[PDB]
Amino acid sequence: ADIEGAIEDYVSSFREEIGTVIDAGDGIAHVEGLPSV
Amino acid sequence: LTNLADELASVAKLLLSETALNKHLAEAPKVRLLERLLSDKVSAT
């Protein structure tokens, strides 16, 4: 179960959070990221 | 080449076993994660 720590360190490796618009239409936008929103 | 193929097959079956890593990896730190995970478990190539 050591890999859990490695992946946690990886995700923590990525300061203000910035998301990315992944789709948009009809006045709605979906944004990936922003884990703390 | 044979050793590389065997190692890659083992890696593929492992990745299939745990889909969480693939999910979190599909989206430079990726490499560092790879060495910290299985740097020596697989050959240099």
Note down, in words, how this protein is organized.
The structure is cut from a larger assembly and holds chains A (37 residues) and B (45 residues). Chain A is an alpha+beta fold and 37 residues long. Chain A has 1 helix and 2 strands, in the order αββ. Chain A has one helix spanning 2-13, and strands spanning 20-25, 28-32. In chain A, strand 1 and strand 2 form a beta hairpin. The longest helix of chain A has 12 residues, at 2-13. The A-B interface holds A 3, 6-7, 9-11, 13-14, 32 and B 18, 20-21, 24, 27, 29-30, 32-33, 36-37. Chain A: Produces ATP from ADP in the presence of a proton gradient across the membrane. The alpha chain is a regulatory subunit. Chain A: This is ATP synthase subunit alpha. Chain A: It is found in: Cell membrane.
Shape of chain B: globular
Q: What is the subunit organization of this protein? A: part of a larger assembly
Total count of strands of chain B: 0
Would you tell me the structural class of the helices and strands of chain A? alpha+beta
Order of adjacent strands in the largest pleated sheet of chain A: 1-2
Largest sheet of chain A: 2 strands, antiparallel
Strand content of chain B: under 5%
Largest sheet of chain B: none
Percent of residues in helices of chain A:
25-40%
Helix and strand composition category of chain B: mainly alpha
Number of helical stretches of at least 4 residues of chain B: 3
Taken as a percent bin, the fraction of beta residues of chain A is 25-35%
Helix content of chain B: over 70%
Radius of gyration of chain B over alpha carbons?
11 Å
SSE run of chain A: HEE
Largest interface: A-B, 9 and 11 residues
- What distance lies between the first and last C-alpha atoms of chain B, to the nearest angstrom? 10 Å
Topology:
The structure is cut from a larger assembly and holds chains A (37 residues) and B (45 residues).
Chain A: H1 2-13, E1 20-25, E2 28-32
Antiparallel strand pairs in A: 1-2
Chain B: H1 2-17, H2 19-26, H3 29-38
PDB class: hydrolase
Keywords: complex, synthase, hydrolase
Entry title: Mycobacterium smegmatis ATP synthase state 1d
